[PDB]
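Q: Could you write out the predicted structure for this multi-component system? I'm mainly interested in how the pieces pack against one another.
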Amino acid sequence: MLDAFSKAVVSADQKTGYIGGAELAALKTYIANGNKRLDAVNAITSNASCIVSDAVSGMICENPGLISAGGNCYTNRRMAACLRDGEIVLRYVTYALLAGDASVLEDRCLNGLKETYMALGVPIPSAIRAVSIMKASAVAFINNTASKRKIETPQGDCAALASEAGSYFDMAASALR
Amino acid sequence: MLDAFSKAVVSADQKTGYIGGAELAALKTYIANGNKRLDAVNAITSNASCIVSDAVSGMICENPGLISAGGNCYTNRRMAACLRDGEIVLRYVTYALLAGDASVLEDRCLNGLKETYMALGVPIPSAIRAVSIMKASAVAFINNTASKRKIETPQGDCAALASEAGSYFDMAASALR
Amino acid sequence: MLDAFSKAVVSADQKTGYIGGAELAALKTYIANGNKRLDAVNAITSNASCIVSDAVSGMICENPGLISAGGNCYTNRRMAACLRDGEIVLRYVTYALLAGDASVLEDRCLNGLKETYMALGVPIPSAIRAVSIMKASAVAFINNTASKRKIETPQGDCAALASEAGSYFDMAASALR
Amino acid sequence: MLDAFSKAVVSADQKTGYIGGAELAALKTYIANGNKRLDAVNAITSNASCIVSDAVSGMICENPGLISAGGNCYTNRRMAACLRDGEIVLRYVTYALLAGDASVLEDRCLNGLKETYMALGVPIPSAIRAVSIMKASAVAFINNTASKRKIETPQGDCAALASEAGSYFDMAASALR
Amino acid sequence: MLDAFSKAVVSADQKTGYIGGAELAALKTYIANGNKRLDAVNAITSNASCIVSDAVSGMICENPGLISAGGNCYTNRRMAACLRDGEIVLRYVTYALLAGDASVLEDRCLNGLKETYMALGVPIPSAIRAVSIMKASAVAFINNTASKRKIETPQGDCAALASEAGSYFDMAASALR
Amino acid sequence: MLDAFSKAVVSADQKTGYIGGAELAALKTYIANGNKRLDAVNAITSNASCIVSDAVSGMICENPGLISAGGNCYTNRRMAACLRDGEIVLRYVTYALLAGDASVLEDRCLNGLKETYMALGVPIPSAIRAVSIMKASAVAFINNTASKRKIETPQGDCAALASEAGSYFDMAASALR
Amino acid sequence: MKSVVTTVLAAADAAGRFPSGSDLESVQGNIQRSAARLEAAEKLAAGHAAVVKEAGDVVFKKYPYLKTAGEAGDSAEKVAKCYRDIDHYMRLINYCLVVGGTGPLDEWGISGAREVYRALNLPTAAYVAAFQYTRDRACAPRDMGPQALTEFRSYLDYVINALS
Amino acid sequence: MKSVVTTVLAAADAAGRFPSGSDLESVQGNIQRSAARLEAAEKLAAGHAAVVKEAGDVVFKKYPYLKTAGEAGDSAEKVAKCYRDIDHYMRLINYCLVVGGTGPLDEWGISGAREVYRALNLPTAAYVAAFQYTRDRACAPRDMGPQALTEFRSYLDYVINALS
Amino acid sequence: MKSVVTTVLAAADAAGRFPSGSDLESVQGNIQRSAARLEAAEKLAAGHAAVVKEAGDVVFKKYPYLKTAGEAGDSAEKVAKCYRDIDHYMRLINYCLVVGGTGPLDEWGISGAREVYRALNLPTAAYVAAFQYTRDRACAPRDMGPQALTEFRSYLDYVINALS
Amino acid sequence: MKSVVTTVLAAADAAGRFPSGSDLESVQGNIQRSAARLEAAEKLAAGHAAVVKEAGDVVFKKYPYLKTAGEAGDSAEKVAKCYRDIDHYMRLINYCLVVGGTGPLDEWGISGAREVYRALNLPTAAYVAAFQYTRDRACAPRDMGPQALTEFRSYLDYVINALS
Amino acid sequence: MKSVVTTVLAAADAAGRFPSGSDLESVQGNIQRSAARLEAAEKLAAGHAAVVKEAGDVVFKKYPYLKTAGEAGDSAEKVAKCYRDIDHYMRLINYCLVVGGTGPLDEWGISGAREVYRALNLPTAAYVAAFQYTRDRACAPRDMGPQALTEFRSYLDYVINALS
Amino acid sequence: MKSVVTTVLAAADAAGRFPSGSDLESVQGNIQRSAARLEAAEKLAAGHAAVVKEAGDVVFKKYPYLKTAGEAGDSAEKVAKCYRDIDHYMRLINYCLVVGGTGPLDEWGISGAREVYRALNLPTAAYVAAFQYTRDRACAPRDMGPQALTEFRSYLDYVINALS
């Protein structure tokens, strides 16, 4: 996998170039925002169980056919598998947010997932909705706007981090379309 | 795998329904015919070696090209493989007849078999003939009409069981077409 | 794998025929040329490291883009992999020349190689050039016409053996086209 | 593993003898008591989770040193492992009771267990107590004398089955001494 | 494993010495007797099935307790295992004779065999007799003195090869004591 | 494995105690010396190849019997294995120094090593000398007293770290006695 | 799906064997026991409405805390899902009794249950109370014969043990 | 040893399961079919010597080439071993009939037989003749009841197929 | 035991590598974050008895059904074990705060907990209530500094998620 | 297909090696022994008709029971298949002699043979009699030289051992 | 590519874990050490021309035999490839300093190097001389600060050890 | 130890086979080629001291940088070890020539050599020079016959390629 720094290294290498002043400055800013990034990750991990269960339950309450006879969340075995998948995706999203790069998520989670779901009969529109709810959830916790649970951090702005996190959930959705 | 009873359970589950009077009556009849079914299975297993060797030999005597140079039963190694396959199919047919359901045969034997045979160059029309001869054979033993060997059972009618057995051999043939 | 003798056996078997006078005479000639064949093999193996390194280096000096950024021999890891592949092909060519038959080369090396290279992004025209240089190299050593290193053997003619060796390198090239 | 019948077969085989007459009479009586044996097994399996948790908790309430730091049931991981072993032993005892022979229990559970417990530092006197509590418990359920939960069976006497079940728990304790 | 030549190399290496002169003379004589050695090996392999079945049957006819209930050749499974071991030992003896050195036999067959036989309850005196009968048999075929089957070889003397073959059977017996 | 902090946790746990006050003070001092510890580790890893080759060569120059025929460093394969072991031991010592605790070294390297060396015929007094030379070497680099290569660090005293590193090499030697 | 016949067939298949005497004999046992368990199945199929309502009512009488804010019965819709779950389990029990083994419960009711109930704050003791009540409420000869009762109670105990 | 109960217990053990409904039901099959097979076992125990003599006599009447030089019946001691082997198999059939499974035949008679008989020049057709004759010589109700006869013949056919 | 240094050393060991730059850099992270978590560890060491009593009181105030017959708090000795367990977890949190990782909780508190609590009818919601209350009761700068509070709360949330 | 060269090449390939001295030297042995075995091949190719007829005639002279109802030679068409089988084997022996190893027999004659002959009631002793007769009938110098005879007899013994 | 974060993420992924305290703490260490190594990266990026020229000049001053016929510097074009290689390595060192771990060197410089240099007659001592000179030529505070120097020298030593 | 016979025996052993025709034929190859290689072995045994001195002299004449400070020939004892190593290899070649295979070189000279020579700063080109010179210095019929020379040179080339 790559992180924000090794990603810049891959670009420099494509040009047989050294990384110096110009390119180094954006990375120093990334470092300066490091404490916030750590808080953003802690905001998701600290609420992982809640994010997943709320998203799968929301997917279901908006489409009750999923828990009807022959729905793909019907039986405890399928419901448990779906909750597990929700957690897997969230876990890889937190990896991406800690690394500052999507490669761990794309390579180890999203690659092949659409094909897996098509072969199993897992309904993709419903999965995309579960992912969307987790996105709303995770972003609210990063921004400290969650309705029922707050997180105390030093006062400031995490909009870029919330957008970056959102983008990783959007890549999950895009990989299934 | 499924049996006759779990097959009815799968149907009831598709309807979120309990199994009661109406649906239970056909299954009680299945139970009442249970001793006959056991005899039908014993009729095939007791003659397994004869059923297989006669069918493969018959396939060959009707198509001597199979044991000519480059025929698919040419060499002891291929002849042994074909005899083995004859026995495998017969074994899964007896499983189906004991269970009262084709799923063990379809899932564990017939799924992928056509593709396997096409990749190997195993001639499918000839395999279908071997299966047909085993069908004639197995059904005669169930009905106690085999020319050279009899089986003593209480007097009665096993026509439905013979037809059911025949249908499992027909599914083997259909899976290769 | 087959050798020159088992290849003749496979042909006789396709005809349900015994191998006798007529067919046996060409094989006796093969045996009579056996010492030369052994020398031909020794000529390649004794120079294996030189054949491979010269061919890969020649491929590169004729196409310097291979060692530019993103070239397929760029980084020590890729250069080492390519040298390894050069050696693998040469090794299977020597196997074929010792056996007097291409089957070991086709079955254990060339089958699937084009697909492997296409999946990896290994540039096939460049591989074909590496193989061509090894061919020139190996044939010169067999004929004792290499510019910088000689091999002392009894005086005579190895043109057929050099052509046979050349043909195995040509089959490597053909399997990639 | 052996059952009650194959145990008889092994003894007859040591004498090169057929089973008839007197040997058969004891076995026919075993069959006649078969329904009671099925109920005896049902008695234990139906209460499995209760037998195990009560025995391990009982071992602990009588020796609370086991849950002090450096006691062998200290930490959830150790307590879980001990509850698991309780269940394993009870499971093999129910196997022995269904089979009417201790071999499954001796061969698959008890053989090597003392040495395992000695190597791990598992306190054998405590393990023996846990086994003794499960014995009291299981026997009570077989006899329908359990204080908090009854089982409805046809009236009669299961003293021999209760002693036999007890003998299997006793073998487990003997195996650890 | 070692052969006769590498055995010499190991001794020379212990002395940091080159092999020339007197060391070579014995080895040149080994080569000169090579055709006889090939015939000696052919003598045993050509009669392998006969040597083994006669030795095991001989062991048994001299000690019929072996086939009584609780004898170690009782049941077809035990008799098959014993015949298999006979064949294994004979096979490794032929390897040793082809190599001109016992190492293959000691390292791959005889090392651990006594302990295996002791752990299984295989009667070692009986095993030693089976080995002794195979010795008599194999030596007879090498010398062309077998009562029911002759082998045509060029006239001469194979006494040294017969003693050497005998020495390998003797090593097997010594390994079990 | 444990580190310096988890070692403290294990002791506190044996007493069912929380870590505060006096326990914490020693640990806070450990943290305060952390930069020096990182430099100490860097001192050894930066010179790893030099420490190992010098120690093994030193062992040999003081006991040239080791490279005579039948010495344990005779042949390139043995010399390579010995150099490898030198590197393995040094690696685990650097792990122990980074962790501030010997457990990684004891559990993953030293446990079973005496018995391995005894079974192989590896001369333990020679191995102990190789360890002693690496000790002298590693300690010199930590203290910046190595004769041919210096390391620039902020001025101060690393005596405690040098003794601790020395203690780990001493544990390796003790493990072999 | 685990039953008498699928278990002997899976063992035969693993060993590459035709059905043999012990396999047929096993299926005979299935024939003998069928009347008792199918009696139980039929009674449950005819009576499930009242059985499910009693069981659900008992859950919330035993554990009225479930109706408090933040708990599993804190809306009418969640209370209904609880009764639904009980209905699902009783249906799976009907299926086990028809099949003559635990397959339907194992696959469709028990597998993954602990994970789901943990994730959704659904206390296992609530489910256990439902089944314990159901088990002990039933009686022979009124509701079914004694061997049918043994069969019915065996699957209830089976689910109780899987959740406790 | 393969029987009704050892097969269901080996499957429960491989899954880490207590015995459940379908295991108990399988064992009830034991109880139903035991009378037929124990009747066959008893008749065979009482009559084995006469049955074995008939079968061995039939072998050498069918295949008198066995008594010629270099063949399996070419000494009195080898002929006696033949009749002994037939007795061994009938004793193993008695054991299968008692156990309710093929285990005793599988482990003590069939495993390794092909390797032994090949090594010792013992034609399998000779054994098949002995068992086919025995199977078809027996009749009900003369020698045993109809269901006992079905059991007896099933194990004879089992052996025939194992040697075929 | 999972910590900064044992994680980088286990990865180096699996690759046969000496510690390198990124391993040393990871350990520097230790040195930066230690003040915040050791402050939390010390405050918890000093105040654990009062924190545990508050948490246990909250459990039985929230779930008084625990004190009724057949439940986890239905004797004085069982109630006392509850408060003891809360103390065990807080002690393990003290240890995690000292180590700088989840190792002590993972190995000594979480592993096997679900199996134990199921066997003993210990509702996980009771434990979650204790930890949620503790997490939200603490505040900075009153009880500890802001970053110490972040560390304290992270391990409480870690446990909550392990029981959820 | 097993021969001198394919065996050394398979060993070289498994070890990732170029052919080396012992490999070339092995092939030299093949050159030395070729005259004897190719002499044998050539004699067999020229004389197979009479060899096959003698062998088949000997089978049925030794075992006239084969012609009786229910046996392997009980029709003219089955008798012909027997002679055909002998012809197949003699052809495979010709191929082994040409290749200088057992490959042709192993792959096309021996593999699966015991299974086929068991299934079709084809006694292995019949085949053994054919080959033993063929082996002992041949002589040097009349039919071939002595080393050619050794080669011819070695493959006959090889098939005899595979069937006995 | 090995760095502080990818190493902790690979360990988390192998154990199926979310990032936890020791993982975040590791990344904090990366933040602390970044100023020193990025200073070093920046100096190298600005000064690489003169660094590479000095290193190459030193190779051929130390080992003038390289310019003799049949050796690695025996043409102008091969001499240039040597300086190019040094440039490649210095670029990879710049990348390691930016990433804060050895990944760029491991993957793009070291893996396969020994095999390539062996095949092409490129003595490893030449490369070692280049890096040893570069390491010892640098000084603080002139070229960079002391901690930047430690970082720069650590990666040079890392490549020296991989080649020796 | 790799030789003609150990290679065919290891292949027979892996297949559970007796030695067969192609194994015996391989060993005949031994008998044909032995004269040429034993002649080479004897000449080398008689002349090894002079051959080793020539080769070592050539190494230090080609690469006088080896005698300078910090290099492999920078003391009298290190120079003496060089000549000793050349003698070790020639002795291993004597052994390969006796055995008829690469085994002695493989096991006692080549395995681990690259790791040793890297650790000890021993340039492989120095060894290659010694063997190339020796290979090309020898001639037939002066030093040995033509085929003996082919054998001698083959093992020298074998070593050259193992160090290349």
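A: Regarding packing and overall arrangement: The two ends of chain I are 23 Å apart (CA to CA).
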